[PDB]
Amino acid sequence: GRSSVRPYLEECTRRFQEMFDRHVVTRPTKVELTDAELREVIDDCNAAVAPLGKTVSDERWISYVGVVLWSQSPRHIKDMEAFKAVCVLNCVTFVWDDMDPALHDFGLFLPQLRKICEKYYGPEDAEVAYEAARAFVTSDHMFRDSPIKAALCTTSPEQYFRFRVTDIGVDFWMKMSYPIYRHPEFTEHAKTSLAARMTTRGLTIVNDFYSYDREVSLGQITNCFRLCDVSDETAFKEFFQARLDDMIEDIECIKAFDQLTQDVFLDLIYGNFVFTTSN
Amino acid sequence: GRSSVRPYLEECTRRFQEMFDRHVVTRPTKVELTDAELREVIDDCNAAVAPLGKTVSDERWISYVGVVLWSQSPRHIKDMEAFKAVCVLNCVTFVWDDMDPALHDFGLFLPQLRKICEKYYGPEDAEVAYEAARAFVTSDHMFRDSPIKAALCTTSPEQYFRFRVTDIGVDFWMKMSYPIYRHPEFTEHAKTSLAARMTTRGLTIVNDFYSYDREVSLGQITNCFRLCDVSDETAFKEFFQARLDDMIEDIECIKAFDQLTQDVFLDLIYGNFVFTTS
Numbered sequence: 001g002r003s004s005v006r007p008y009l010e011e012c013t014r015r016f017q018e019m020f021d022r023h024v025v026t027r028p029t030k031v032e033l034t035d036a037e038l039r040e041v042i043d044d045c046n047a048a049v050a051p052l053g054k055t056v057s058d059e060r061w062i063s064y065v066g067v068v069l070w071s072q073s074p075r076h077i078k079d080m081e082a083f084k085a086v087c088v089l090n091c092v093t094f095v096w097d098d099m100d101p102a103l104h105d106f107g108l109f110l111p112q113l114r115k116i117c118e119k120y121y122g123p124e125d126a127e128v129a130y131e132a133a134r135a136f137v138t139s140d141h142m143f144r145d146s147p148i149k150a151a152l153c154t155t156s157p158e159q160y161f162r163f164r165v166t167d168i169g170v171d172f173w174m175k176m177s178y179p180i181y182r183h184p185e186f187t188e189h190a191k192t193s194l195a196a197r198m199t200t201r202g203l204t205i206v207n208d209f210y211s212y213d214r215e216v217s218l219g220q221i222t223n224c225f226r227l228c229d230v231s232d233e234t235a236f237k238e239f240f241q242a243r244l245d246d247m248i249e250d251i252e253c254i255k256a257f258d259q260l261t262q263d264v265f266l267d268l269i270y271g272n273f274v275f276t277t278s279n
Numbered sequence: 280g281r282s283s284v285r286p287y288l289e290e291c292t293r294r295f296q297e298m299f300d301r302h303v304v305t306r307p308t309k310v311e312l313t314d315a316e317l318r319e320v321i322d323d324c325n326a327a328v329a330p331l332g333k334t335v336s337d338e339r340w341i342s343y344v345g346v347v348l349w350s351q352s353p354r355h356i357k358d359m360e361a362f363k364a365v366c367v368l369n370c371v372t373f374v375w376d377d378m379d380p381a382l383h384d385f386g387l388f389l390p391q392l393r394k395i396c397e398k399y400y401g402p403e404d405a406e407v408a409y410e411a412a413r414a415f416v417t418s419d420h421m422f423r424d425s426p427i428k429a430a431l432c433t434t435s436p437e438q439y440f441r442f443r444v445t446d447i448g449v450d451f452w453m454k455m456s457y458p459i460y461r462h463p464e465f466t467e468h469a470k471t472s473l474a475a476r477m478t479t480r481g482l483t484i485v486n487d488f489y490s491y492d493r494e495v496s497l498g499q500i501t502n503c504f505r506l507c508d509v510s511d512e513t514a515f516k517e518f519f520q521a522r523l524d525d526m527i528e529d530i531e532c533i534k535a536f537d538q539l540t541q542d543v544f545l546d547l548i549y550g551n552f553v554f555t556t557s
């Protein structure tokens with residue numbers, strides 16, 4: 001009953017798209033990697049997870065990298081080495097998040113993350129990106145089975161989204177993506193985490209809706225829709241409307257930011273939705 | 280702008296204390312600096328702000344440093360070099376927030392912050408502390424008269440507190456304070472800024488109430504109580520109770536953290552109340 005949002009899948013997808021068309025208007029665009037770039041990305045991905053003895057096929061990597069291809073802001077890219085680092089860091093932390101946690105060898109993995117950062121970023125940016133990656137995968141480790149997670153995720157939407165600012169990876173995302181754009185204001189918003197805080201709900205609500213069935217079947221509690229009775233059409237749709245209102249207020253405030261910054265923020269939110277709803 | 284929360288000053292003070300007595304219980308305790316340590320701190324503060332030309336008296340310094348003496352967690356302190364750094368970094372960024380922006384010389388001030396961090400912290404912590412200080416003062420600068428400040432501060436409690444995570448300085452505070460304690464869990468929560476997100480509303484709500492009259496008289500908008508009509512006793516009491524409920528919910532979640540970490544969070548919120556009402 002509460003095991004599935006399947007009855008709402010089409011309507012909610014329509015409503016998400018309708019909101020974006022009214023409030024963001026500009027559609028997201030795909031980044032094309034040359035086959036050299038893509039093999040380079042994938043090679044780095046393989047080298048970084050090999051110490052954990054894990055093999056991962058090219059097409060699995062390409063499914064992982066799709067979110068980065070779709071959710072950056074191609075208008076504004078200025079550094080494609082930073083872009084590739086984000087492709088790599090995203091994919092390997094994807095692979096890390098999808099392993100038995102008693103296969104997690106930090107001594108083996110963290111230095112691979114540092115090597116990626118040092119390859120693609122300047123000296124200062126390498127440290128910023130690496131600390132963000134370190135802090136993300138460290139958060140993930142220390143909150144498995146944590147009473148803190150249960151408290152933040154079951155108490156209120158406000159407590160849950162506060163947890164997700166880090167846990168969904170959007171602070172990590174912002175802190176390794178600002179070198180792509182070299183835009184002073186965006187760099188500051190990324191480093192204060194305001195960038196992450198402005199985009200967390202737009203990203204998390206979409207992510208949660210389309211992974212609800214999988215996550216609750218796996219016993220996972222990091223999902224906002226577990227806060228309403230999904231089996232109750234009236235309660236579900238009041239909750240979903242509240243989440244839509246959350247996304248709209250965020251997007252309306254995001255438009256107070258400078259133009260380039262707001263472009264990146266909205267391409268992220270809307271691009272993630274497009275990527276999420278594709279094959 | 281000609282508004283005031285004076286008619287509620289007593290009752291809100293009593294309501295605040297009562298909430299803390301029921302939900303935190305543990306009293307905050309003042310850190311007493313020896314005479315040598317207070318001198319070392321004032322000397323460092325005076326050095327840091329000497330390049331900006333203007334003078335700060337001992338008594339102002341000591342009024343600034345009191346929030347640090349009261350709002351840390353004394354039973355858990357392990358590193359007093361780190362503690363002194365927070366005294367100095369708090370005081371001088373206070374003085375900087377208190378200056379006409381027309382005199383905000385970053386090229387003079389940022390090396391002084393870096394100097395403080397390099398004297399008191401290990402090399403890794405010194406970069407964390409410095410970067411949070413840099414990000415804090417840079418945020419203050421780019422949001423003065425910025426349309427983003429006006430949109431975040433006037434739209435809803437949620438957008439306003441989202442802005443204050445950085446703007447009230449608690450993220451900076453966490454990221455320079457964790458070396459005081461060398462507690463692994465607290466260090467991570469500081470570095471993910473979860474520590475700052477848990478404590479922002481309890482700090483900001485207290486700070487906003489007791490600075491409201493001052494701030495509205497100066498045309499400042501960074502105060503959540505501008506979001507209700509404080510001249511409407513009925514509206515103010517509903518808004519004030521909403522913010523108490525926010526503090527209570529946060530405090531109750533804070534107690535799900537490990538025992539040392541939660542002591543630090545709650546001593547910070549409760550000690551800030553004590554210092555503000557002192």
Ligand SMILES: [Mg+2]
Binds near residue numbers: 097140167
């Ligand atoms: Mg995860």
Ligand SMILES: [Mg+2]
Binds near residue numbers: 208215
């Ligand atoms: Mg998910």
Ligand SMILES: [Mg+2]
Binds near residue numbers: 376446
């Ligand atoms: Mg201020």
Ligand SMILES: [Mg+2]
Binds near residue numbers: 486490
């Ligand atoms: Mg104030």
